[PDB]
Write a structure and sequence with these properties.
This is part of a larger assembly, with chains A (69 residues), B (207 residues), C (321 residues) and D (138 residues). Chain A has 2 helices and 5 strands; from the N terminus they run βββααββ. Chain A has 69 residues and is an alpha+beta fold. With 207 residues, chain B is an all-alpha fold. The chains are: A alpha+beta (69), B mainly alpha (207), C alpha/beta (321), D mainly alpha (138). At the A-C interface, helix 2 of A face loops of C. Chain C: This is S-phase kinase-associated protein 2.
Chain lengths: 69, 207, 321, 138
């Protein structure tokens, strides 16, 4: 269900986005961003350093993480 | 302004020493005050404060040092009339309390504070001493005219100072505690200490 | 009729019914209305959610007398050039906003009556925290994700800040054992809720013991992703007399069934332990201790202004939809 | 009981005390015929009507349509009515009149506002550019 994407990057950060099914999607907060504790409690599976760095308004069910090099 | 101020003073002088003026006069006064506050009336506030202090000092010139038993018959009546007339005055200059004393002092509370400056005078210790002398009819004698004491007591309770202490809350009985309750309790203790043993040395303890 | 003859309190009462665009528009009518467009009673509560803006614009607006400034996820990537007077703001939200270090330093070097702050996601440094030391009235604070400052800075901040009610010093990605040690050593004594997650290889039982022995008033607590907390830490929390919502989620060193013993602390209400409990065994834990709430809320609340556009229960009147 | 209110030129209108009690000034006054020399009888009758329709009230923002139709008149009497409502200090009436004026100002340009309200413009042709500069971030 939890669909991941490849890594694409510029010279300074490395990014990733993740798509979620409906049930997890309907929980994402519309007000504040998240923290690693928070999205691990959601059910993401990835490393240390990934930061949830914005929300795309038209489609809330897509998360965007980035981390430095 | 000025041309307003003289007639306002005349009307205020009328409202103290009350002769039950007619509502036409009071609408004249209220219209004067409202007209001045539209043209932001600090100087009018200064005039009011000064006039109150002056009149109260003039009154205190008389009635000072009547030594007892009239300082009550004086003080209670003066306080009663002053409180009532001041309530009326707060009624008149009521446009201030809504649109300039919101940026800081309500006229009623100002009058109370000025009467407090009439309390921190020989009118403080003499009154309490005379009241204690009156209650000294604990022994006997129904001369304790309860209305001659309730007036002073309620006056103390009310006079608990309020000028931006915190804001209108409720019973501010600081003044009562610190200026009348103490002496009352101490003198009660002393009087009972005396008369108790005085009786005790003469009778079987049953009595 | 001469409507310019209107008195100022009437004009203000009129203007207290508008919306920010029109309030701006009318300011360009005549000099008196220009004065009355900014009278420190219209500018109680601002709102600039996501709007891009400029340092001088926000400086002027704050100097006008704002109280509750809500500006989350807004972008301020330009240098501040003007000076001001000490601001009057009392609640400030800046979560996740992309701002410059120099601009943020300049802005914070004026506010001193901060009753509530947020700085989630941002990046700080030594001058910023040194200036922030002045705020001797911080009820709340929130520094999640921030990074860059130093131990001397942290200890000075925590010493100066005395009334700190809730603290969320979470997830920072440059800390050290020194950082967490000096933190817990100098934490104020009234901390009702505190978060210290993330610091897996820096949280130690000695420091947790120091915390539980210094502060007796923890009510909400979380230590997520801590990999060196054992059941001795367990009995540590047993000294806490007000822990109502603990969460040790993904604390690996804890064997699941000792979680049953947590139910034995009296004043507990919830326990979020995501990660450790194998599925199905959640029912086992529920049966073992059915007087609690396990895994009923994913999201934190420790000094988060918004969880509902109202910041911290306050309503912003001047807004932009 | 009742009370006889006299306007600026003698139009004594008798009104129930429980109606004039709305006017806070008159309320605190009857606490302890009267002329109100700041109100002409024309506006006074409308004030009485508004109080009567509201006499048993409980005690945007959904202007009651009764007041709305009661407000469907031009500038001059609206100006005078607001001033009188202030002078007598009756809460809801001033509230709704203020809201009406606010909404009628809503939307129009500074030029239209200046024309309709008969406001004498000043300090122009060099500073309006600056004040508009103070409004880009809109």
């Amino acid at each position: 269900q939890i669909y991941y994407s490849d890594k694409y990057d510029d010279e300074e950060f490395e990014y990733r986005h993740v798509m979620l099914p409906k049930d997890i999607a309907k929980l994402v907060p519309k007000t504040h961003l998240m923290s690693e504790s928070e999205w691990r409690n959601l059910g993401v599976q990835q490393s240390q350093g990934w930061v949830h760095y914005m929300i795309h308004e038209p489609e809330p069910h897509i998360l965007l993480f980035r981390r430095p090099l | 302004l000025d041309q307003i101020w003289d007639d306002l003073r005349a009307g205020i002088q009328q409202v103290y020493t009350r002769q039950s003026m007619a509502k036409s006069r009071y609408m004249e006064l209220y219209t004067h005050v409202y007209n001045y506050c539209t043209s932001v009336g600090l100087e009018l506030y200064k005039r009011l404060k000064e006039f109150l202090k002056n009149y109260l000092t003039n009154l205190l010139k008389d009635g000072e040092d009547l030594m007892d038993e009239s300082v009550l018959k004086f003080y209670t009546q003066q306080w009663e009339d002053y409180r009532f007339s001041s309530k009326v005055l707060n009624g008149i200059c009521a446009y201030l309390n809504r649109h300039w004393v919101r940026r800081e002092y309500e006229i009623y509370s100002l009058a109370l504070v000025t009467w407090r400056d009439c309390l921190f005078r020989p009118l403080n210790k003499q009154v309490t001493n005379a009241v204690l002398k009156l209650i000294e009819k604990e022994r006997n004698g129904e001369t304790i005219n309860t209305r001659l004491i309730s007036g002073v007591v309620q006056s103390y309770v009310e006079l608990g100072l309020n000028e931006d202490d915190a804001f209108a809350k409720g019973p501010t009985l600081t003044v009562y505690k610190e200026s009348f309750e103490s002496q009352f309790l101490a003198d009660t203790e002393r009087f009972y200490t005396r008369e108790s043993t005085e009786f005790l040395q003469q009778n079987p303890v049953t009595e | 009729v001469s409507w310019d003859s209107l008195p100022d309190e009437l004009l203000l009462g009129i203007f207290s019914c508008l919306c920010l665009p029109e309030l701006l528009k009318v300011s360009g009518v005549c000099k008196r209305w220009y004065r009355l467009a900014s009278d420190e009673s219209l500018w109680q509560t601002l709102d600039l959610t996501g709007k891009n803006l400029h340092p001088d614009v926000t400086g002027r607006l704050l100097s006008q007398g704002v109280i509750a400034f809500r500006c989350p996820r807004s972008f301020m990537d330009q240098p501040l050039a003007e000076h001001f007077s000490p601001f009057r703001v009392q609640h400030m939200d800046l979560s996740n906003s992309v701002i410059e270090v120099s601009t943020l330093h300049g802005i914070l070097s004026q506010c001193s009556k901060l009753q509530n702050l947020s700085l989630e996601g941002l990046r700080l440094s030594d001058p910023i925290v040194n200036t922030l030391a002045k705020n001797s009235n911080l009820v709340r604070l929130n520094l999640s994700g921030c990074s860059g400052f130093s131990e001397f800075a942290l200890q000075t901040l925590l010493s100066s800040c005395s009334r700190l009610d809730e603290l969320n010093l979470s997830w920072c990605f440059d800390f050290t054992e020194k950082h967490v040690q000096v933190a817990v050593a100098h934490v104020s004594e009234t901390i009702t809720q505190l978060n210290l997650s993330g610091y897996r290889k820096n949280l130690q039982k000695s420091d947790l013991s120091t915390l539980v022995r210094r502060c007796p008033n923890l009510v909400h607590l979380d230590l997520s992703d801590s990999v060196m907390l054992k059941n001795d830490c367990f009995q540590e929390f047993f000294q806490l007399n007000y822990l109502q919502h603990l969460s040790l989620s993904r604390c690996y060193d804890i064997i699941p069934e000792t979680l049953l013993e947590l139910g034995e602390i009296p004043t507990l209400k919830t326990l979020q332990v995501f990660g450790i409990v194998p599925d199905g065994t959640l029912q086992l834990l529920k049966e073992a201790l059915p007087h609690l709430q396990i895994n009923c809320s994913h999201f934190t609340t420790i000094a988060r202004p918004t969880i509902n556009q109202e910041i911290w229960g306050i309503k912003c009147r001047l807004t932009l939809q | 009981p009742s009370i006889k209110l006299q306007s600026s030129d003698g139009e004594i209108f008798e009104v129930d005390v429980e109606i004039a009690k709305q006017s806070v000034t008159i309320k605190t006054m009857l606490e302890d015929p009267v002329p109100l020399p700041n109100v002409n009888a024309a506006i006074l009758k409308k004030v009485i009507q508004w109080c009567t329709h509201h006499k048993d009230d409980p005690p945007t923002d959904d202007i009651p349509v009764w007041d709305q139709e009661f407000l469907k008149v031009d500038q001059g009497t609206l100006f005078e009515l607001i001033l009188a409502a202030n002078y007598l200090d009756i809460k809801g009436l001033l509230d709704v009149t203020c809201k009406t004026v606010a909404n009628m100002i809503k939307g129009k340009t500074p030029e239209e506002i200046r024309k309709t309200f008969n406001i004498k413009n000043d300090f122009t042709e060099e500073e309006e550019a600056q004040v508009r500069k103070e409004n880009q971030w809109c």
